[PDB]
Structures are given as structure tokens and as C-alpha cells.
């Protein structure tokens, strides 16, 4: 439902990031991609997005196709679907307690229920000293766990995350890579993106790696 | 669902409060600056209210003399005053007697022991009748048929400007026609500026409620009663500035006015003016939120 | 004798032009001074007129005088 | 000398921004422009008026008369006389003759002195002082009554302090005039261009944590305000040109109808410079007042 | 040298950020100070950046104290720091060759050098064909790339940064890492923070270790 065929974007400089990628993901795989600095991996899970068209070939996603979509039927699809990404930014001079909220009054929730899944998603952010604070008041690398933790919340059909343990400890990212299988315990879609090739060679992933925009580099390696 | 509807307007309404509380030095600041140029269309309009009640000194001017004969009688006097009244272009028409003729001229310096010698009173009774309306050239061809009484003495008019009040009008009209354009297309540019840079202020808050969901609605609460409250801190500020301007400018109307014997000077304002007032500023805040978002979201549309 | 009816012709023809002067006073006597600053008129205009009203009322006094005087001796008999 | 490379590079990167949407910064420019004509259109229209005073709001008139016997040659020298007094406009003396004259064509009948054989007209002084404050009232009616030779003078209504109650009238309006639209001028430009630097406020932390001075800072965002200012004072000459000729259309009707050659001057090129920079001198202080509260908001200590 | 001596850092919030530390810093002395999460590590970075109060205790760098000095003078010190910091400091809408050269506008070097100097970085990184763009035009690597850069550049005697390639591939990162050292080769101090400690190991240096903003976790491996 998510294959991808003869799809590409180009761009209008003189570089073009991405020249064919044609992959099909299983549902409630736990999927991992790697690759050099050269190779574009963050344009292939913004495709997925998609908040610019990809200009050539077809995609899928369920019955509604990514190739012409319109205003009026894409935040149906965005509000469903929870990510985080890297250029860490977020409410500025607020507290930390509606930003996890962000999507739970865009959805539509009674208030009793809001607070307590705040507190039951923290336990494992280790952040029970600050559950009420400012953004600037975290820290730089609690503040990339706090938007684990948005996409922990409400729990997503669709999870994409980002680059995660981008500040976090080897000790304490062990405990956040378990989260990840606990979430896709049911049928949900997990997409990581990581490139530390000692944590990623335990278990069962599918490593995708990328050189140049040249999707076809590695096997199924299961 | 209505209830979620209710809660997003309510949620928003009280960030909004707590926002308004914060920079209080900025927050009053931008307050003043939208009340302050309001207070121009509207106060001028309230002058412009305000003179036009005072038409006697205007409608005085230009006043039609007729002379009777030596022989005098008060019943053709009422007869042509009730006469003229009933043709058009008036006001009102008033008739002293020669007895009134004689008291006004015995406190003045004239007619002083005179009436020894006079067998009787030979000052006629005159009308005096001012045109309810001046305009265009063309107004001096009334002079024939005031000629048409039986009794015509003397008909000494100023012949040359009465068509020149038809000047000086209209020229007046068309000068607050002047200002009455240009005030109001400064008022809608001042305001569509300042709420259309707050869209462009803030700006890395949209696209991160923009991926992750939402829809031109959520996004623009925040704003819409920024815009109002705003407003609504513009129609306060405007009050306490006009209340004190008309204070101020009063004494000087009915020294004026008591100078001239009569009893006018600067009114109040209304509550149902004021009220008006009011709303047309939360709803010039209101349109012109809707205006400056449509920028920034056709910016990043998906398309 | 001859001199009565010379007096009393140029009383009435005086009756007749003050007459006439207290209804030419009542014609620019009741100009209102908003007429004033307008109608191409120095403004020393329309307002000594009637202080020039005063002037001819009191010089015709020493004609009256005059002419009264002199009733009274030729009314001897 | 790194100074001056530094202003050329800071003014190009200025004209790059304002063409980077140029719809929305031409809009800004309006709004500068239309407002700043309040203080400075009706500056002119108080420059205008005061050529012709004396048939408009100013026809004070005092009767003084003199006795009987009278000679030009007096009369002349009380002219210089009360122009001695700082509020006088006209000293003029009019003659025996000529002033009979008038008053027979005002009654419309000519038989004044074909009764009595003997004038008894006396030859009077015209006093038209139009140039008073008028403020004393009749009490400098009675102060200009202290002549020897007067004999009697009148003023009907009072009429120097109703003169006082236009001119207290006329000078209070304009003052309230005054004060409120420079307050509505120096409010709306202090608001815009310190809500434009309120925005783009990552770019100001960028160099203050790798280094940089206060001197570097505002200088892209210096010549960003004073522009506006220049382009507002050109626009506001543009409309100052259009509304001038556009009532040049009906003044023209009262100054043929009158008689006289009363034409009004518009968009002078020493008045037009000096618009164009006081809108850039003001850009100037109200973009140093901004950038001083972005210094305070983020200070490390 | 630099002398660390006792400081400690209360916030007004109401949280202790760093109860006590004290360090010893030699002229070109490499350090490696990493510890779990809620180490300040990066906030005693804040502090040697002097763009925090030092609230408690001395805190000491160079020949100047850091405390109760001028505001219009400090920026003169951080001139001479490359500060890299996680949050990427770049001017959006800009050309790249300027993101570079963002100290070089300041200290007053002449023009036609300027455009060899912005070309003799892009090499050392491993980065080209991706001159004159937008920073928008980069890949989420490549502002850590262009970030390194801005650190690397004119020589600074004292390099402050945290954390490269964090999320970038460990193939390159060795070289990236084998830049660090031929800077280290000078005359110079790197106090670079790595928050990982996998890569690291192979590398023979001094090592730091904070736990809950105690004075010394673990000894040092010298
Ligand atoms: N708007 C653009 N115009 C031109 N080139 C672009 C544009 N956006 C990205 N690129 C280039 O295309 C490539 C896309 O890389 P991408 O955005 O996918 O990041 P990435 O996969 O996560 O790589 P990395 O490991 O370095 O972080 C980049 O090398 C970049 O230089
Ligand atoms: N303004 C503040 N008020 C109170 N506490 C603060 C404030 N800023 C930071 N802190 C505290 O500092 C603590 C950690 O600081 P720091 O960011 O330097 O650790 P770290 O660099 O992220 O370590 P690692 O990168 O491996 O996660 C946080 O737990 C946070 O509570
Ligand atoms: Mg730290
Ligand atoms: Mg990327």
C-alpha cells in the first residue's frame, strides 16, 4: 500500500538529490535506512509527507494517491499521522504540557484524560523532575525525547520519527529502541532512520542504504 | 462535533487573554496606535454632527427687506408673512410693527427727541426672510415677484454676493469631501499593515501545527482575537481622547454662544454611537485577520 | 399777515423728508453684522452709517429750532 | 577601513530583501507615505491663508469721528499714529465730500444737503484695526477711545470680544488639530518599524553568540528603516501634487467672482527636500529605538 | 592554562543544574568530557561561552575572569571561539559562501582572499558542488557540515563544539574525527564534547565523566 515505483524529485538547482527510488515496505516491519552525506534519505521520508509534489511517477498510499493531492484531503492524512524531525523547534515560552497536547485537541479530547497521558508517557523519558517547564528550561537532549514522546502519545497509525539518539546516551538509547518494538506491537509502521551500525546489527531490520540517491545498495539482510 | 468546537474557541480565547498579558509595555503600545487614528474619521464626524445644528447664524445672511408705505396696517403684515412662509426657499418669515421700529432705534444712538415734532410714526414695518437653501447662480430671479406686493418702497438688495454663497458653500462640502475620502483610506491602511506584519511575526509556529495536522481555522484563532481585542482596546482608548477633547473645546463654544445670546456649546456622545463605534473596530480587526493570513498560507500550500 | 403761511409749507415739506430720512435709516439700520467681512464692503461701511443716521437727525434740531422760534413771534396778534 | 565595505555590503543585501517579495514591502510603503501627509498637507493650507487677511476672518472696524472742522494734513498724521500701536492692520482718512457721497447712494435718495444751506457733516477717520488679537474685548475699545478731539464711537454688539470668540475659536482648533495628528504620526511610525525587527529574530542571536558588535548589527536593518522613509517622502509629494491641483478646480471659482489673481502654490522643491528627509532622519531614530530593545531581551548577564 | 576551579550554577527556576565541578585544562590539551543525560555538560559549554551568570563559585578561562565583566566587551572573546552548537546557527536565505565567511566580515581581511578561503574549507569537509545555494538546499547532514566549517576556519586558538556527526555516517566520521586531531597537532585547545563513547574508545586521550552535576563520575583514562 506504500510501494513506491520510477518516482523522483527534481529540483530546480544545479543538484539534484534523488534519482530513482522503487521500494515496497510490509506493514508492522521495523525499518532502518542508512547512508553517506551525499546520499538523500530525509527527501525520501518527506515524500512521504509530501508538502511538495514529486514531479515524476506514480505513488501509493491506500486508496488515495500522493500524485495530485489536494488542499481540501491532506490534513485528514496529516492529522493521523505523528513526526518529529531533526531541526528541533517548538513552542517557544510555553509549558511543555500542551505541546505533547499539540494534536489532542486537534483530534478532540475531554479534559480528564489529557493530563494523565502526559504523565504515563513521561515514566520512560525520564523527565518526572520536569513535566511542567518551559522548552528552553529542558535540556538540548531532552528536548529531542520530548518529541519521541509527542509520537508516543495518541498512538499514530502511521509513525515516521527522525534521527533519533541524536543527543541521548548509548545506555539510555537502549531503552528508547525497545520503545520502538512496544509501539509496533500492533499494526503500525515504524521508519528510523539511523547510522550507528553497532546498535542497528542486533535484531531483525531491514537496512536500506543509500549512496548518491541509488536506492538499490543492499539485500533484505534478514 | 459542537462540543469540540466550542472548547477550540474557548481554549483560544483564554491564550489569547494570557498572551495579551504578557509584553505589557508592547501589548499597549500597538493598543494606542489603533485607537488613535480612529478617533480622526469618527471625531470629525461628530464636529461636522455638531455644527449643523447651529443654521440660524448660517440661515442669516442674504435677508429679504420689503418696505411698506406711509399708511400702516398690521393685517396685510401677517397676511404676507403667512404668504411667504407657504412659497418655498424659506425659513421662516417675521414681521416687527412700527412701534417695534420705534423701541429699536431709541436705545441706539438715533431718533433721539424726535418724536416731539413727529405727528406719527412713519418707519414702515419690513420682512425679513432667509432662503433655506443657496444653490447654484440663478437665485436672483426672486427679485420680481417681491415686486408683485402692491406696496414695494424699497427693494435694496447687495446684489453681488448672494450668488457668492453658492461659492463659499459647496466649496466647504467638497473640502470635507476631501478629507472624508482620505482619512478612511489612511484608517484602512494602517490597520491592514500592522495585523498583516503579525502574521509575518511568528512565524516558525505555523508550520510545525501544519504537518502534523490541523486546518486554516486553528491556526487563525490565535490571531482572531488578537485582532479583536485590539480592536477592542482601540474603541477605550478612542473614548477617554474624545471625552477629553470635548471637555477641553466646550468653554470656548458657549462663550461663544452666550456672547450671541443663545444656549449652544459641545454636546455628549450617544451609548448607541458609542456602541457602534466599538463594533466596527472588532470587525475592521476581524477583516483584516482574514486578509493577512491568506498570504502566509498560500506560502507554504501543498499544492 | 403774509409771513404764517411761509413757515407752515416748509414745516410739512420737512415733516415729509425726515419722513423720508427715518425710512432710509430703517434700510441700513438693520443690517446685521455677519453681512459684515462679506459682499465686497469695507467694514467702516455698514457701521457709521447709522452714526451718520445721528447727524442728520441733529442738525435738522437747530432747523426745528429756528423755524419754531420764529412761530412765536409771528403769531402776535 | 573595513567600515565602508561593510555599509556597501549591508545596503545591497537591503535592496535584495525588498525585492524578495516586492508586493508586500510596496504595501509598507503607503502606509508610510498617506498618514505622513496629515502633518505636512495641512502645514501648507496654514501657509496659504495668510496672504489675503482682510476680507476673510478679519474685518475689525472701529468708528472714531472728529469734530467739525477738520484738515487732511491731521488726519494723515494720526494714520502713522496708530500704527505706532502693534495691533493695527489699516490707517486711512476719508474726506467731507466723498463720504456724503456714499451715504446718499446707500439711502438710494442724493437729497441730504438740499435742505439745510450749511454742512454740518464733520470730516471723520477711518481706524480698521483687522490685524487685533482682539482678546481685551471693549476694553481696548476704551483704550483706543482716549483721543482729545473724539467725540463718540460705537461698537454694536460688542463685537471685539465675539471677534475674540471666532479668534479664540480659530486658534484652539488648530491647536487641537496640531497636537493630535503629530501624536497619530510619531505612534504609527514608532509601531511599523519596530514590529518589522521583531521578526527574523534568530538572525540577530546567530552573530551575537559567534561574536559580532552593535555596530555590525544594525546595519543592514539602518538602512532598511531610513528606505521607507524615502520612499515614503516621495509618494507623499506625489499625493500632496494631486490634492493641491485637484482643489485648484474651485478656488478659482471664488477668485474670479471676488477679482483678484489668487493662485496656490504647489510642491515646492524646498519644502519637497526637506519632507523626503525628515522621513529618513525619522526612520533612523525609530529603528536605533527598536534594535536597543532586541540588545535588552536576550543580554547574557 | 586554563584553571578550572569550583563553580556551580543555580538557575531562578527553582532547579540546581551543576552542584559542584572542577576541571584542570593544559594549553592543547584534548578532553572528551561525557557523562549520562542529566550531565550539563553542554551547559558548562554555556558557561565557558559566558553567556550564562556563573550564579555560585569562579569559574576561570584565559587571562580575564568570567564574572562581573562588561556586556560591550565579551563578544570580542567570542570572536576567537568556533561555538558549534546542536541548534543550527544559519542565516536562512542566504548564499552558503556567506555562512562560512561570518567571521571573516568582522575581523577586517581583505576581499579577493575571501573567495579562496571559503573554497579551501569546502575540501577539508568534503563538500562540494553545493556552493552558492541557499542553506535550505542542503542535506540535514550538510549544515553540520557547513556548521563544522564555520568552526574550522581562520585557526581559532581556543575550538569549542559538541557533538559532530551525530548524525552522520561513522564511515565518514572518521576522517571528520581525523581532522580534529591535525587541528589538535597546533597549537590549539579542543574541548570537543561527544556524547558517544562506541568511536571514541579506539582514540588515546583523556576522558572526563559528570553524573548529576557531580565533580568527577569516573577517573580519568590518561
Ligand atoms: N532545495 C534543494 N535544491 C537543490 N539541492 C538540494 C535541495 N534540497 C536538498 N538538496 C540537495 O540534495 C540532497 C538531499 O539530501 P537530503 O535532504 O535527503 O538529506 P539526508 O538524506 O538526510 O543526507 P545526510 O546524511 O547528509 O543528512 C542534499 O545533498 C542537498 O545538497
Ligand atoms: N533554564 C534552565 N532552568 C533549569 N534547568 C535547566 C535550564 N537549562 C537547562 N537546565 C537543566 O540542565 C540539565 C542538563 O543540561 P545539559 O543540556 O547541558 O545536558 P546534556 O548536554 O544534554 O547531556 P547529553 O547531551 O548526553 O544529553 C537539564 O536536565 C535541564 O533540566
Ligand atoms: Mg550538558
Ligand atoms: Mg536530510
Known sequence: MIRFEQVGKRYPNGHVGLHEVSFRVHRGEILFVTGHSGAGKSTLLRLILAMERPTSGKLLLGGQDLGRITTAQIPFLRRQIGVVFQNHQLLTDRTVADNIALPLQILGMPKPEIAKRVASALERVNLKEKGEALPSDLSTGQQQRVGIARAIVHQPALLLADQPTGNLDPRLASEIMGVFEDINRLGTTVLIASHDLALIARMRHRMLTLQRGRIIADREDE | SFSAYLESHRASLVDSLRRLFGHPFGSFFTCLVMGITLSLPMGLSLLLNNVERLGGSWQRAAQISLFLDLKTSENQGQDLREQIERLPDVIEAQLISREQALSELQEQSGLGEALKELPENPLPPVISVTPKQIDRAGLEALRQQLAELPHVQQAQLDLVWVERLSAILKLGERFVFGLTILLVLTLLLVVGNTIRLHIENRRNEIEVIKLVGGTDGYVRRPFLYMGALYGLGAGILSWALLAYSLNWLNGSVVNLSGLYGSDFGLQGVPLDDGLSLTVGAVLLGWVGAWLAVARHLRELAPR | ?77
Open chain 3, 1 to 77: 399777515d403774509g409771513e404764517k403761511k411761509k413757515l407752515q409749507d416748509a414745516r410739512i415739506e420737512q415733516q415729509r423728508l425726515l419722513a423720508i430720512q427715518a425710512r432710509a435709516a430703517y434700510q441700513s439700520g438693520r443690517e446685521e453684522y455677519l453681512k459684515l467681512l462679506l459682499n465686497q464692503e469695507h467694514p467702516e461701511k455698514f457701521s457709521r452709517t447709522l452714526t451718520y443716521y445721528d447727524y442728520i437727525n441733529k442738525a435738522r434740531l437747530e432747523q426745528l429750532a429756528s423755524f419754531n422760534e420764529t412761530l412765536r413771534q409771528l403769531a402776535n396778534v
